[PDB]
Structure formats: structure tokens, C-alpha cells
Amino acid sequence: TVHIDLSALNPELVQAVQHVVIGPSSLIVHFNEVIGRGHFGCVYHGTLKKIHCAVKSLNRITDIGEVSQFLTEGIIMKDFSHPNVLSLLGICLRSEGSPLVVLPYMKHGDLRNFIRNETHNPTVKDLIGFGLQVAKGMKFLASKKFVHRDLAARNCMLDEKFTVKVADFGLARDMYKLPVKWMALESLQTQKFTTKSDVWSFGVLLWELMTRGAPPYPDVNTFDITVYLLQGRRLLQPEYCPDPLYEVMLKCWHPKAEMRPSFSELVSRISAIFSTFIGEHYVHVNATYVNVKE
């Protein structure tokens, strides 16, 4: 019930955030049709020529300090612009501090549900291509010294050109329960995350891709994944995963974080493997993974 007067905000901060601000007449949020839902708010179809967008309605912000941090995050996120990264269209703030985050609309939704869909017919080439795109997005994000911490197929999205966008970061961060099965050994133990721990998660994402969205370690008690790994174990090679790509996954899971490939090396290696395929190998679903909850 707290009142907030927005006119109390820093003049320099309101000036610097202008290029990220969307006018009240520039945006039409269709509160009728919900397209997504997270812990921090619902996502609605929006109209921003008229372009489709995704509008996330955050919880009403009541402290002007927290408003300032929301604006600062907007400016930084705005500059995380890359073909393979979900790229912020702008931010909106209504009377009494009702924030709207405006993102490009992703026609094909999240990458995990896309690959799981039985009506889709991916080839090895298609799936490796998606993996390659994710590596390019992460290469960019690492160059901005940004550590994602929650890289997973569920957190990447696909547009109408089948361009993959690394998403779920900055103002778009949400659960749409740490993601322990995507976490590097050292992160499970020290709770610290780096670009090299993102490379571990990326290897798990490649495994998700080649299994068409199987839950990793299907029969492993989440509360014991460190013990399981320390027995001397990794995810098995998916049936339709090429040997060199499985070799890349094993590199992503190197026990020594500094020995893992950079995203730059991953883009290079995966571009080469991708180039060898012509789209003749269809990837089918493993009977033992069908209906297994994650």
C-alpha cells in the first residue's frame, strides 16, 4: 500500500535512462493474453510499424533506491546487444512504480520445449547449429565479463528465423532450487560462479540438445550430485551425438576449471564440427527419457 513519488528520482539518472525508456503511447500491453509466467511477474504479448514484443510486468517497486537500481540495470542490459543474446527493447515505469520490461517476442519459445516437440524433425546439423548459436551468445556475454550462472536449454529462446537467443539474464532473470545438475563441481562446493562454470553448464546444454531435451542424470537425487560426480562420472554420450561433439562436452566438464575451453574456442571447434553435416541425420527420441520429469 506504500505510495511512491517517482519525481523524487535523480535528474542525471532519469536523463541517462531516456534511450531505454518507452513512451506510454509507444507501447500497447495486451494484459488479456498471457504468454509466460515467472516468479517475479507475468509476461504478456505487447505491440511496440507495429512489432510483436514480450512485456514482463514486475512487482510494484516502492523504494526509490530500488527504482534507481532497476534503471541502472536497464542501461547495462540495453548494451548487451548481440544476434545470439535476448536484446532489451526498453523499460517502462507506470504511476506508483509498476515496472514493465519489454523484450523481443520469441515465436518458437524456449529452446528446451522446442526440441522436445515431437512434431519437430531436427537433424544432427540443426541441433549442433543451435549449440553453436548459444556458444556465440556466450562468447559475447563472456567478453562483457558477465557470468550467466543459469545457462540451460530452458533459458535460451528461439525466434522466427530459428535464431537462438541466450536469455534469462539482467531484468529478464527468473525461474520460468539452484540448478545443481547444470553446475560445475567447484560451484557445487564453493557456491562460486565464473565463465568457466558457465562452460560446464554449456556442456550440459549441448547434452540437452543432442537428447532433444532429456533431463540430465534422470535417476540421480539432486541433493547428492556432487557425490555422484566425484565417483568418477559424467553424462553418457547421446545416441545421436557425434564423437567429436561428445569430446567437446567432456572438455567442458574438465575437473580443472582453467583447463576448460573458452567460449571463443567452443565457437571455433563447434563451427568446424557443424560444417561437416548436411542435414541427413535425423535425431530421434530415446525411449528411456520419454515422460521423465526434470
Cβ atoms within 10 Å of 63's Cβ, excluding its own? 11
Q: 89 in helix, strand or coil?
A: coil
125 makes contact with Cl ion (CB under 5 A)? yes
Q: Which of 57, 155, 197, 201 binds ligand SX8 (CB under 6 A)?
A: 155
Q: Determine, following the binding rule CB under 5 A, whether residue 277 of this chain makes contact with Cl ion.
A: yes
Q: Which of 5, 79, 126, 150 is catalytic?
A: 150
Q: Is 108 in the site for Cl ion (CB under 5 A)?
A: no
DSSP per residue, 14-70: HHHTGGGB--TTT-EEEEEEEEEEETTEEEEEEE----EEEEEEEPPP--HHHHHHH
Does position 127 interact with Cl ion (CB under 5 A)? The reply is no
By CB under 5 A, is residue 124 in contact with Cl ion?
yes
Q: Please check whether residue 114 is in contact with residue 212, taking contact to mean a CB–CB distance below 8 angstroms.
A: no
The CA distances from residue 78 to 47, 65, 86, 116, in Å, are 19, 20, 10, 31
For the window 234-253, what string marks contact with ligand SX8 as x by the rule CB under 6 A? Answer: --------------------
Full 3-state SS string of 175-212: CCCCCHHHCCHHHHHHCCCCHHHHHHHHHHHHHHHHCC
Is the Cβ of residue 123 or residue 286 nearer to Cl ion in the bound state? 123
Catalytic-residue membership of 198: no
Sign (positive/negative) of CA torsion 294, 199, 110, 58? positive
**Residue 40 binds ligand SX8, judged by CB under 6 A:** no
**DSSP 8-state class, residue 292:** -
Residue with smaller CB distance to ligand SX8, 4 or 101: 101
Q: For 211, list phi and psi in degrees, rounded to 5.
A: -100, 5
| 135 phi and psi angles, rounded to 5 deg | -60, -40
Of residues 109-148, which lie at the interface with ligand SX8 (CB under 6 A)? Answer: 109-110, 113
Does position 48 interact with ligand SX8 (CB under 6 A)? The reply is no
Q: How far is the CB of 41 from ligand SX8 (least distance, A)?
A: 9
Which does residue 277 bind out of Cl ion, ligand SX8, none, counting CB within 5 to 8 angstroms by kind? Cl ion
**Active site (catalytic) residues:** 150
Give me the residues that bind ligand SX8 (CB under 6 A), please: 35-36, 43, 54, 56, 86, 103, 105-106, 109-110, 113, 154-155, 157, 167-168, 172, 176
Interface with Cl ion (CB under 5 A): 123-125, 277, 279, 281
